[PDB]
Symmetry: D4
Subunit: 139 residues, 8 copies
């Protein structure tokens, strides 16, 4: 019988290109960041920490990547997704490693999520811009 399925997954060479571009963008902005790239299962591919970035931002970047890979949409959209539902507004942000502020983006290929990128250390807008620079460098 059939026991397997073929799944698309992000490769480490592309993650490496992405963290190079995200850190270069941070340098161009005058900021210091952490940037994490994870695969489809949420497992590390490349995690880069610039000297002098905020200490807490290490885990935030990892969690942003994990959240974006795990759900397939940008972390900054979470509150919009939760809407007026108080059960979700209380419950979802309380989950371990789930980030609801901006800076995590899914890695989409053929509209299929194959990984995630997360940036922390700047403003939400700066984080997303560095993450987008990483996505563009993957291509």
């Amino acid at each position: 019988m059939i026991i397997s399925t073929l799944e698309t997954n992000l490769i480490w060479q592309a993650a490496l290109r992405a963290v190079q571009a995200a850190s270069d963008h941070a340098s161009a902005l005058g900021i210091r960041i952490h940037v994490a790239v994870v695969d489809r299962a949420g497992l590390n591919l490349v995690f880069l920490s610039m000297n002098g970035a905020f200490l807490h931002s290490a885990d935030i970047a990892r969690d942003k990547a994990y959240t974006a890979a795990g759900f397939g949409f940008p972390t900054g959209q979470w509150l919009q997704v939760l809407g007026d539902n108080e059960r979700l507004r209380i419950g979802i942000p309380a989950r371990e490693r789930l980030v609801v502020f901006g800076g995590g983006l899914p890695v989409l290929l053929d509209r299929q999520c194959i990984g995630g990128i997360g940036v922390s250390g700047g403003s939400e807008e700066q984080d997303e811009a560095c993450a987008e620079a990483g996505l563009r460098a993957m291509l």
Copy 2:
């Protein structure tokens, strides 16, 4: 000299029927879910994860089942149960593994809770439907 009590407990064969039905229902709805069934002490009986379900939903399903088994009522009813009590509204949702959004249902037999079922991966309404399919498959 009496040291023991006889307690009713959910059996693994019924839990297996439940995860078969819950996953089949998810397939019919076009969704990917995690479904966890636990016994009266909150211990795993069967935990099933469909490929492509959200990563965070694994623990959410487990915690939904645990909450429903631990309190004996559906997780979606928590906010109604807490009402206007601000001490409880702050403190209860902050407990480890306690879920206050819908998708966890107690397994009731003769008015007695003997386990729990929790589904995560869809909307609250989809999660509850799959859990109910599972419950109907047990009996």
Copy 3:
């Protein structure tokens, strides 16, 4: 411009067949077991616990499946693989979730590991037999 790779992964329907067969085999042997099946990334597909199995065996089964999927060879072979290397004999068994006794088997397809199965609750020989029943039920 290449960012992705196609990987084979075990599917939850096959994992379900495996836990059905492993538990039926345990029943035929007169034992109570836990059986865990994980995918290529070590994530749960199905985890089944029979009533009355040893409490500690829940995590042992999960860790056996994870170890077998993570390394691609049966957990019972670890000591043979480590040989006379004292650095490895001290360090490898000390890793989190790494099991060096028998009961975890890789799921191999076309010479490629796509997941793992782990059984705990009997002797090593009983655990391996149940795991093998599960593997045969997948294909």
Copy 4:
């Protein structure tokens, strides 16, 4: 269909009698101990800590009770059970909450394990004697 089974479980009143007797025995011996009694699922029924007992012995007592309840035989017998099997001698003592020195006893009724008692703070022989005093007081 059938979904449930009737299980025998230790009751808290008996656990309370047991910790009273175990602590009284410790006092009679001139020692200070922790004594834990758990039910069939390994969940606390009564956990008592005498002022001045060793700090580490709190968790040891709990783990002894859990191990004895989880496997159904005295913790002090573990090495005999493991024998010459190096895979088990390395792997089993490395499991979280698994204790292989003496002081945990199963609570047996009709040769069925319905809970566990664990004592820490004295010698292994003193621990087992206090645990036995607790078992006798349950009856």
Copy 5:
């Protein structure tokens, strides 16, 4: 090099859990009750069969909170008042409970331990904890 401290004793904790559980039985509820010493360490922790699973840790945390601060857990939001920094930060601390059911054990104006009950309403939890305290004396 040293100081003399008053500490709650395990015999008194045992009296307390007996009285708290007897009160719960009289109320028709099932509870967990935890008694801890001045350092927040366990003295006696009792779980009645059929009490809520989550209430085990709630009881322990209530006792710990009450022993650690020296005032009833139900008073926290009254102490926090309108300070939004404290209202956000204090309830987020591990093992800190801000709903009712934890009481300090006070002797001669001095906190020597704590008792915490979980499994009923806040009001029932506090009543069981008070029964435990009275049994200590």
Copy 6:
């Protein structure tokens, strides 16, 4: 090739002076505190716990020092920094070891953060005072 950068880091002798001054300030106020001083990587330099200080305040002091060292600004300013942004107001206070109440201060030397000091056990005011004393010292 360049593989290194030079960093300024707080030294343990200065942290020791700091915890001495903070505890002396607490004694003058009649209160009991925990005071933590960490280096530029958030690692302990000196962590002092006064007998009788609240049990929960131990980790709070450490978290305050860590937060102040990790971001380079006082912990009491967090809400002002978060402003009206609900995404940040929900998400930032939910991070492990991140404290948004007052009492953590960065150790700034020549426009540069080289460590942190955190105090817990009194009112926000008393904590900030003891921390300011440790810093002044």
Copy 7:
């Protein structure tokens, strides 16, 4: 009824003197250490980390103090205490925060353990020396 007992406990001022003397001894030896002093319940009193000491030695020092306070005898004696008992030799060193190497010493006052001191970062000999200095002080 009796609900309390009086306990002797180490005070934070003595711990502070201890970490000062232990670090001065380390400086005289040319080494960098962590030194932890805990009270009779194993709770921090003073924990000092010298710049440049091994990263892993931080938790080792704390564990040494905790073990010495929790059992009341030097950590270096554990193997002698375990003797030829294989059950204990496997099980005791596997416990969390339990250290069987030298460097943790109980603080004994009038035949009674009131705390612990632990040093890590040098050889067993250097650690014991720095700890003995803190104790002597």
Copy 8:
């Protein structure tokens, strides 16, 4: 109040992970490689698709061990010698790796970070780590 410390920079860590992974590709193996700074904090952590799952944390712990002690992880049993207390206690420490594959990053007799590789044999891991170090220069 301060001291000047040399620290490894993220650009050099990035060069190192590129060279270590290129060496692994040339060997036909799949590896994780972690580079950490002087405080044991991540600089770059790279995981090649298809490397062993457990090797992720092994690589990180190797880097941390090498950075924390300043000598190769493969040398630990040589350093422990015949001391049974250390042979039992040291390999039991969290994140401490005693098999080969972690190397310190040394600059002018001074440890400024660490590199750790896991996924091949000890000898292959060390070869990949050495390639990473050479690429730093």
